[PDB]
Amino acid sequence: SMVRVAINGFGRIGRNFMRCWLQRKANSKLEIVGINDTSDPRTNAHLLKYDSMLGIFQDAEITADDDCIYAGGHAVKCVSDRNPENLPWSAWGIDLVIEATGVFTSREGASKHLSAGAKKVLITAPGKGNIPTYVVGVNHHTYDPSEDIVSNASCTTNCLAPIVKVLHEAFGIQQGMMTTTHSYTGDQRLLDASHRDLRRARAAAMNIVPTSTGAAKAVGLVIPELQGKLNGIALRVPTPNVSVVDFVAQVEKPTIAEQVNQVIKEASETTMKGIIHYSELELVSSDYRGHNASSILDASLTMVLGGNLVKVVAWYDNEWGYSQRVLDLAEHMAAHWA
Amino acid sequence: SMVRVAINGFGRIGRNFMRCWLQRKANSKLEIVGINDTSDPRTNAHLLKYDSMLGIFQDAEITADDDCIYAGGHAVKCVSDRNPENLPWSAWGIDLVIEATGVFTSREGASKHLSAGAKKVLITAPGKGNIPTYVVGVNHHTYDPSEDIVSNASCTTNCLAPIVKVLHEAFGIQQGMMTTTHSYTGDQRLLDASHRDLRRARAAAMNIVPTSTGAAKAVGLVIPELQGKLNGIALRVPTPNVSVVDFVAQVEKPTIAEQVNQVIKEASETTMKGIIHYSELELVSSDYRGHNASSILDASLTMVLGGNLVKVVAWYDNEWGYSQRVLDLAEHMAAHWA
Amino acid sequence: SMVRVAINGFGRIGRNFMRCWLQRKANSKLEIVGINDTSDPRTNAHLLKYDSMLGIFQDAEITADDDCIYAGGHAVKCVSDRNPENLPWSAWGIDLVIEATGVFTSREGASKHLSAGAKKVLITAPGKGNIPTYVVGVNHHTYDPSEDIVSNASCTTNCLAPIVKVLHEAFGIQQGMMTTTHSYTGDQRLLDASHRDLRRARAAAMNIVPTSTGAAKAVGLVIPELQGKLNGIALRVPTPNVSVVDFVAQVEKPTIAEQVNQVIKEASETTMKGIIHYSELELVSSDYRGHNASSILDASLTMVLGGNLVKVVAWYDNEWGYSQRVLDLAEHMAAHWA
Amino acid sequence: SMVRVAINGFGRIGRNFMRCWLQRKANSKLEIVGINDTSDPRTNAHLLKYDSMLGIFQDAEITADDDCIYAGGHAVKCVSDRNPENLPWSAWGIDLVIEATGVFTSREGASKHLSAGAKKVLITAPGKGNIPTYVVGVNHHTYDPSEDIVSNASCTTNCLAPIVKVLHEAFGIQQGMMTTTHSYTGDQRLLDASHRDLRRARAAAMNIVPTSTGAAKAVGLVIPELQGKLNGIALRVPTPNVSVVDFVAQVEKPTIAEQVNQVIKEASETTMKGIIHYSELELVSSDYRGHNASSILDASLTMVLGGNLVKVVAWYDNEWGYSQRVLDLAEHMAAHWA
Amino acid sequence: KTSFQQYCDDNPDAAECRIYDD
Amino acid sequence: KTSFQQYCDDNPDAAECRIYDD
Ligand SMILES: NC(=O)c1ccc[n+]([C@@H]2O[C@H](COP(=O)([O-])OP(=O)(O)OC[C@H]3O[C@@H](n4cnc5c(N)ncnc54)[C@H](O)[C@@H]3O)[C@@H](O)[C@H]2O)c1
Ligand SMILES: NC(=O)c1ccc[n+]([C@@H]2O[C@H](COP(=O)([O-])OP(=O)(O)OC[C@H]3O[C@@H](n4cnc5c(N)ncnc54)[C@H](O)[C@@H]3O)[C@@H](O)[C@H]2O)c1
Ligand SMILES: NC(=O)c1ccc[n+]([C@@H]2O[C@H](COP(=O)([O-])OP(=O)(O)OC[C@H]3O[C@@H](n4cnc5c(N)ncnc54)[C@H](O)[C@@H]3O)[C@@H](O)[C@H]2O)c1
Ligand SMILES: NC(=O)c1ccc[n+]([C@@H]2O[C@H](COP(=O)([O-])OP(=O)(O)OC[C@H]3O[C@@H](n4cnc5c(N)ncnc54)[C@H](O)[C@@H]3O)[C@@H](O)[C@H]2O)c1
Ligand SMILES: [Mg+2]
Ligand SMILES: [Mg+2]
Ligand SMILES: [Mg+2]
Ligand SMILES: [Mg+2]
């Protein structure tokens, strides 16, 4: 039957994921039966319906009472406990927790859901420590059905890894540098305020904000041959969603821009269909709101120098495209359940 | 002797106030000797120096160690405890606490500083309950040196009340409505997220966001004749600092726009000098960054209908202008310290 | 037979209007057959499809060649001449020109389209001089089919006038003041630069920018009893679309906020259905993108003082809602074409 | 005596340049005696004084009449003719024109100033065609005093070229890729509107906007050994000033991040003092407003892979730092005048 | 009283709980 | 009348000359 899902953390990713599932619910093996969050259900039904980025939810009515959110007649039980060890996962028969709070990314943290009665946890972020990491379209077929805690990596890793896999298999990636020019996220401050990261402390809609990213090194988790061969950074900029990866690779097989584009286009039509989209259109970030691909190659921007130095640029909707991949991974787990 | 000051809450107002005092330190009866804040001295020294709105502080060196922030050799001891009852106010000989956390605005909350040993508290916000409230230039000469807890009202009340006082004395205000088109503040979420106020939940730099406000009613605390005669709202918009009050008043004595402007101009040159500035220039919000007045009348926008319905528009730097008034009120309390 | 329409000026309003008509084409008496604009068909087809505010047009295919834009097989001939007297209106059998350039708002200017052969002109802006002005839902039934040049007023007048009409009929408006907190528009500079208006010269996305406006006075054109009784201003703020009117009225019949809201709610359900929407929800500007009403009353913000001083607040999508009204007015002219 | 200067185009660069000169006027060989611009002198004095980015000009009074702008008692004659062939350069005795309109960057265009009576033209942009190009600190000592039309390159070229020169001389640059994450400029559209570049057509404060840049290839103009070896792109983002270059180089001599940083730091203290600044601070774009360097290396972001793949990141104030370099080049020409 | 309301009583400075009168 | 004002008479759609009543 259905894998019973609870969302822990009903934030940007938790709510994007919920909308993704509501739109793909007819062919799903998942049933979202519960939400735990800081807020109450009436606040969360309001935010689920009224979204500054996604617009008003149209496909079904969304209401709430003291105990549940209702989406098209489907009742989702709600609780508000910030310690996951206390959550009613046994009583609600939760099979799978979508861990989207941002604060339970280690095994010890995510395992609190297992103590509370859930069977598995999917962390919507890179894991801290020894947590199996998957990027759909890159290594999700390696999923081991015995694993209890998994990570779907980051949004930037989901954009970069498919492109890297294609370039590596065609040309041999020896080293690569990345910079993501990335929309701001809720971890940054609206106005200058204390933060563990002195740059993320700074007014997010007023500044270009450099920050670290594990996304390059995490590509080595999902493409093990490239461990230690990639590095990079992020520049957070004053847009609220949609990001772009700039990847400069040192490759073994000498090539030219036309051939790099042909290889990625071919992959986007076959092995990476639905994961990489290939575009020759002269578009901007707003045009990629709601795109379902992990990576949209902007083919007009590809350049190569000296045969071996390759630059590619790929868009990604960091909220929605990533949440589509969370749903894809959860469906894959549900179809390989043990 | 100097009045020894501690800042509780080293946020936008706490740090603007610190910079206001550092610039006026030569003529001051106050000595800032302590800070309590949720963050540490090194982070807070960094934020004090590097401000997205005010720019880099260059009047003096700002450094820090584990225990203190140093502002030109002048040492400010730092502690980090969210419970004011635990603070070292007796141990540090604190006379006056600048209560800038946004949290301890009731008498019971602010009195926790008195329990910890401070002699007086100045709340940088409207007080809750029966806390004496002052607007410098309107009623600060009514301050009683025996009062142990006072409020400096809000930024919007400090802009509106001087204008209201001048208009009331010239024309007789019978009723008045206000809207502040206001820069976003740190109480709003950067992206749509959990909030007890469904409007403040919404992405602040992407939206016009209405909020209720007591700022117009509060004018009646500082102009008691107008208790109950004023009301209004706020519209938060995607600028990070500087705001503008639109005030529409029903007045007793018939007038015209030219007379309204001349009355405010006369006050700005005499009884309200330093509090109201009068401008006929066609400026925009950025031009009022760092302005020291509580209210800058935009004279070109004044209009009157039917003799008795008056519209005036006044700018204010909600961070810096308000912090100048906090310092003015504190210096007044120091001059009258019994 | 169909009324043959040409759009002059394929800007924000011209393209919003085109998209409004494409969605309502099945029930329309209008056929858009031509566009004149300073740009070329390929550029304009790209902008029609890829809109930063409206998203990608997906109802039909949009293509172009050297001579035409094609919207689902439907061909729209294109020309590019800044002088309307040179336009092929007789050659194309144009009945009605939608004058959306912002430039030909006087009778002499708009009449250049008549000289070129069009039968009537609808100006998407206030007219200059004695041009009959209409607000759908307020006075459009007074349209005379013999008029050759008409104005659909401004976006702000279309928001304010329906509210004013309802309030005037219920309570008797004696005088009223307006401020629109308004999204920036293309008349403002992106960075500080040359402009005949020193406020519009200033960087639009970085500032609150006051401008004078005739929008409140213009309500007196469509509600003649209130000629000379209304005035107001605009504050342009850093959002790209959606605006809000704050209206403060002196009324004859004493009232309270609850009655003001019920009167507008009743009108929104009856005589103003489709023109005024009534909302008790705590929403923000992004939520009103694409709303079809001329005015959405934000009922939670209504307030009254002393019986006779009434404040109401109403949202409007200044691009899309106004363009729906342009289409409504054009369909009305077509239904009454003599 | 003094080289008499006229500014053609009193825009962001023209006005930043004017303020740069006003602040360095005591030790200058230049006298700014004239301005030609679209606007009149009163508008331009207003914009010179009231700047959304630079703040209100403090160092001297700025006023105007029908004929002149006055800066601290210095009278600057003003004219408004968009055809430079008509300008009064002979009558005003203009030696040097600062060509800052953006539209006379070819020799035929810039030579119109020579026909009008000027002796030399300095184009504040890359030249079109065979125009000698200089970057101060890289090749300005090669200035040939017989040249009549010169180019100061672009802001991005001025940031990148000094860093490239240092890296090339230390490690040998074989190839390099650049991406500038760049503030929007006045060539972009505030809201979607026609433009020769379909991406620059799109709402600038709402979008990440990829665009071409000649800056990489132009580095080969000022470092001839690197002709054809560099390429790159720009991503325009919603900040109004301050930009950052991300440069990924393939170098001959194998190195590590610590050594790359040491080499640039040493250059910044000696051969590149005043041109490159070296920073280990964790700052954001707002903190570099008004910085006088062409390039500020963000040393914390330097990374190297495999010895030969080097990433460096450098900030630049694209308005002010570039205008300081325009002034430096003009002073160099004035000191080598023939 | 909801758990969220108790949370804001216990953490009035938290991002979910701030009310600045402006 | 200034040259700028004549420019806006001749180019009312130019960026320096647009006045949308809003
Ligand atoms: N936003 C993106 O683009 C993006 C993309 C990929 C991954 N992620 C990752 O997804 C996670 C969530 O990010 P987000 O942007 O949605 O953040 P968010 O702050 O919008 O959402 C976090 C949600 O969890 C709630 N929460 C916090 N602590 C909690 C607790 N102890 N118990 C219950 N609920 C709690 C918050 O109230 C909020 O509703 C993070 O790990 C982030 O790194 C974000
Ligand atoms: N920002 C303005 O324009 C403005 C103007 C006038 C008044 N105010 C008022 O000033 C107050 C602070 O506003 P702000 O804009 O500076 O907010 P802020 O969020 O920037 O600053 C609050 C500071 O207090 C700290 N803090 C919170 N709880 C604490 C506790 N229990 N102990 C110690 N430190 C704590 C926070 O970490 C932060 O540094 C609010 O009441 C606000 O309404 C703000
Ligand atoms: N944008 C709004 O919210 C809004 C709402 C209501 C009314 N209006 C009014 O509609 C008009 C247009 O506004 P907009 O926002 O669409 O501006 P816009 O600048 O986006 O569009 C104007 C279009 O007309 C073209 N144009 C200019 N002069 C021309 C000429 N001589 N011949 C042919 N084409 C020409 C321009 O190239 C542009 O495509 C203005 O009068 C404005 O006040 C705007
Ligand atoms: N803004 C930057 O960051 C930057 C940096 C380096 C170089 N540049 C270059 O500097 C030049 C100017 O750029 P800007 O950003 O200052 O643009 P801008 O649009 O702000 O300024 C151009 C000025 O020239 C005026 N002008 C236009 N055509 C004219 C004519 N025919 N006669 C007289 N005046 C005319 C305009 O009215 C405006 O005042 C461009 O070549 C640009 O590429 C810009
Ligand atoms: Mg090679
Ligand atoms: Mg009257
Ligand atoms: Mg009354
Ligand atoms: Mg190597």
DSSP C291-335: ---SEEEEGGG-EEETTTEEEEEEEE-TTHHHHHHHHHHHHHHHH
Instruction: Give the β-pairing of D295-298 and C68-71.
Output: unpaired
In contact, B96 and B78? CB cutoff 8 Å: no
Closest CA to C304 of C268, C244, C251: C251
Residues counted in chain E: 22
d(CA C88, CA C86): 7
Helices of type H across B119-256? 155-171, 219-222
In contact, A117 and A94? CB cutoff 8 Å: yes
Is B227 exposed, middle or buried, given 0-12, 13-18 or 19+ CB atoms closer than 10 A?
exposed
Residues of D in contact with B320 (CB under 8 A): none
Separation in Å, CA B81 to CA B8, B37, E11 = 10, 7, 13
Our answer to whether residue C155 is catalytic in this structure is yes
d(CA B301, CA B281): 10
In contact, A247 and A158? CB cutoff 8 Å: no
Separation in Å, CA D11 to CA B83, B272, D185, D186 = 54, 38, 11, 9
d(CA C136, CA C168): 17
Interface of C with B in 158-177 (CB under 8 A): 174-177
Q: Which residues are B291's β-sheet partners?
A: none
Residues counted in chain A: 338
| Cα Rg of chain D, angstroms | 20
Q: What is the DSSP string of A224-267?
A: GGGTTSEEEEEEEES-SS-EEEEEEEEESS---HHHHHHHHHHH
d(CA B268, CA B26): 26
d(CA A240, CA B200): 16
Is D47 exposed, middle or buried, given 0-12, 13-18 or 19+ CB atoms closer than 10 A?
buried
Q: Name residues whose C-beta falls within 8 Å of residue D217's C-beta, 6 or more positions apart in sequence.
A: D227, D228, D230, D231
In contact, B330 and B13? CB cutoff 8 Å: no
Closest CA to C161 of C242, C222, C229, C213: C222
Residues of B in contact with C177 (CB under 8 A): 248, 303, 305, 309, 311
Closest CA to D246 of D159, D331, D327, D141: D159
In contact, C30 and C330? CB cutoff 8 Å: yes
Q: Is B302 left (phi over 0), alpha (psi -120 to 50) or beta?
A: beta
| Cα Rg of chain E, angstroms | 9
Q: What backbone torsions phi and psi does residue D149 show, to the nearest 5 degrees?
A: -130, 125
Q: Which residues are D178's β-sheet partners?
A: D232, D247
Is B29 exposed, middle or buried, given 0-12, 13-18 or 19+ CB atoms closer than 10 A?
middle
d(CA A196, CA E10): 23
d(CA B70, CA B41): 9
SS3 B305: strand
How many Å separate Cα A167 from the centre of its chain?
Answer: 21
Q: How many A from CA of C306 to the centre of ligand 7?
A: 4
In contact, F8 and F14? CB cutoff 8 Å: yes
CB–CB contact C190 D203 (8 Å): no
d(CA C159, CA C263): 17
Separation in Å, CA B91 to CA B30, D204, D278 = 18, 55, 43
Residues counted in chain C: 338
Cβ–Cβ contact D39 with C under 8 A: yes
d(CA B75, CA B53): 25
The single residue listed with the structure tokens 């142990």 is B148
Closest CA to B188 of A39, A190, C183: A190
State if residue B180 touches ligand 2 by the CB under 6 angstroms criterion.
no
Interior/surface letters B41-53, b for 16+ CB within 10 angstroms, e for the rest: bebbbbbbbbbbb
To the question of whether residue C270 is assigned a binding role by annotation, the answer is no
Cβ–Cβ contact D238 with B under 8 A: no
Cβ count within 10 A of residue A39 = 25
d(CA C162, CA C37): 32
d(CA B315, CA B299): 11
Q: Name residues whose C-beta falls within 8 Å of residue D5's C-beta, 6 or more positions apart in sequence.
A: D21, D30, D31, D32, D33, D34, D94, D95, D96, D97, D98, D330
What DSSP element (H or E) covers D287? none
In contact, B136 and B325? CB cutoff 8 Å: yes
Closest CA to D232 of D244, D247, D243: D247
d(CA A18, CA A323): 9
Task: For the domain covering D154-318, report its CATH number.
Answer: 3.30.360.10
The single residue listed with the structure tokens 């420019």 is F7
Q: Which residues are B260's β-sheet partners?
A: none
Q: How far is D237 from chain A (nearest CA, A)?
A: 7
SS3 B157: helix
In contact, B104 and B113? CB cutoff 8 Å: yes
How many Å separate Cα D305 from the centre of its chain?
Answer: 32
Is C142 exposed, middle or buried, given 0-12, 13-18 or 19+ CB atoms closer than 10 A?
exposed
What DSSP element (H or E) covers C17? helix C12-23
Ligand 1, atom 40, lies closest to the CA of A102
In contact, D80 and D42? CB cutoff 8 Å: no
Token couple for B150? 């006072």
Q: List, comma-separated, the residues after which chain C is broken, a break being a C to N distance over 2.5 A; otherwise answer none.
A: none
Q: Name residues whose C-beta falls within 8 Å of residue D47's C-beta, 6 or more positions apart in sequence.
A: C192, C193, C194, C201, D10, D15, D39
d(CA E4, CA A306): 59
In contact, C231 and B310? CB cutoff 8 Å: no
Separation in Å, CA B121 to CA B19, B147, B149, B332 = 20, 9, 5, 13
Is B130 exposed, middle or buried, given 0-12, 13-18 or 19+ CB atoms closer than 10 A?
exposed
Residue limits of CATH 3.30.360.10 in chain D: 154-318
Instruction: Give the β-pairing of A62-64 and B230-237.
Output: unpaired
d(CA D216, CA B7): 50
In contact, B121 and B150? CB cutoff 8 Å: yes
The single residue listed with the structure tokens 């500038």 is D180
Is A147 exposed, middle or buried, given 0-12, 13-18 or 19+ CB atoms closer than 10 A?
middle
The single residue listed with the structure tokens 């037979």 is C1
Closest CA to B304 of D88, C229, A317: C229
Ligand 4, atom 32, lies closest to the CA of D82
Q: What is the DSSP string of A25-41?
A: GGG-SEEEEEEE-SS-H
State if residue C186 touches ligand 3 by the CB under 6 angstroms criterion.
yes
d(CA B278, CA B295): 8
Q: Which residues are C229's β-sheet partners?
A: none
Closest CA to C15 of E6, B228, C23, B237: C23
In contact, D16 and D319? CB cutoff 8 Å: yes
d(CA C200, CA F16): 9
Is D102 exposed, middle or buried, given 0-12, 13-18 or 19+ CB atoms closer than 10 A?
middle
∠ Cα B244 B249 B250 (to 5°): 170
State if residue B11 touches ligand 2 by the CB under 6 angstroms criterion.
yes
Interior/surface letters A183-219, b for 16+ CB within 10 angstroms, e for the rest: bbbbebbbbbbbbeebbbbbbbbbbbbbbebebbbbb
Q: How many A from CA of C301 to the centre of ligand 7?
A: 19
The number of CA neighbours under 13 Å toward the Cβ of B235 is: 32
Closest-CA residue of chain D to C14: D193
Closest-CA residue of chain A to C56: A287
Amino acid (1-letter code) at residue A316: Y
Amino acid (1-letter code) at residue C225: E
In contact, C159 and C215? CB cutoff 8 Å: no
d(CA A294, CA A136): 9
Instruction: Give the β-pairing of D295-298 and D309-316.
Output: antiparallel
Cβ–Cβ contact C242 with B under 8 A: yes
Cβ count within 10 A of residue F9 = 10
Q: Which ligand 3 atom is at minimum distance from the Cα of F19?
A: 43
Tell which one of A13, A46, A185, A291 to mutate to probe ligand 1, the residue whose CB is within 8 A of the most ligand atoms: A13
Residues of B in contact with C208 (CB under 8 A): 181, 237, 239, 242-244, 284-285
Q: Which ligand 1 atom is at minimum distance from the Cα of A318?
A: 3
Residues of A in contact with E5 (CB under 8 A): 40
Interior/surface letters C41-53, b for 16+ CB within 10 angstroms, e for the rest: bebbbbbbbbbbb
How many Å separate Cα A125 from the centre of its chain?
Answer: 7
Token couple for C185? 């528009």
Interface of B with A in 196-235 (CB under 8 A): 196, 198, 201-207
Q: Name residues whose C-beta falls within 8 Å of residue D90's C-beta, 6 or more positions apart in sequence.
A: D116, D117
The single residue listed with the structure tokens 């006779």 is C308
Q: Name residues whose C-beta falls within 8 Å of residue C97's C-beta, 6 or more positions apart in sequence.
A: C5, C6, C7, C8, C89, C113, C118, C120, C121, C122
CB–CB contact F22 C180 (8 Å): yes
What DSSP element (H or E) covers A125? none
State if residue B163 touches ligand 2 by the CB under 6 angstroms criterion.
no
Amino acid (1-letter code) at residue D230: L
Cβ–Cβ contact A103 with B under 8 A: no
What DSSP element (H or E) covers A95? none
Closest CA to C308 of C249, C247, C241, C240: C249
In contact, B219 and B156? CB cutoff 8 Å: no
Tell which one of C7, C10, C13, C133 to mutate to probe ligand 3, the residue whose CB is within 8 A of the most ligand atoms: C13
The single residue listed with the structure tokens 């963000």 is D298
Residues of C in contact with F5 (CB under 8 A): 196
**How many helices (H) and strands (E) in chain C?**
7, 18
CB–CB contact A177 D309 (8 Å): yes
SS3 D300: helix
Cβ–Cβ contact B24 with D under 8 A: no
In contact, A162 and B23? CB cutoff 8 Å: no
d(CA C87, CA C81): 7
Tell me D206's DSSP state. G
Closest CA to C185 of C195, C175, C176, C177: C195
d(CA B195, CA C167): 34
d(CA C252, CA C308): 6
CB–CB contact E19 B186 (8 Å): no
Instruction: Give the β-pairing of D96-99 and D120-123.
Output: parallel
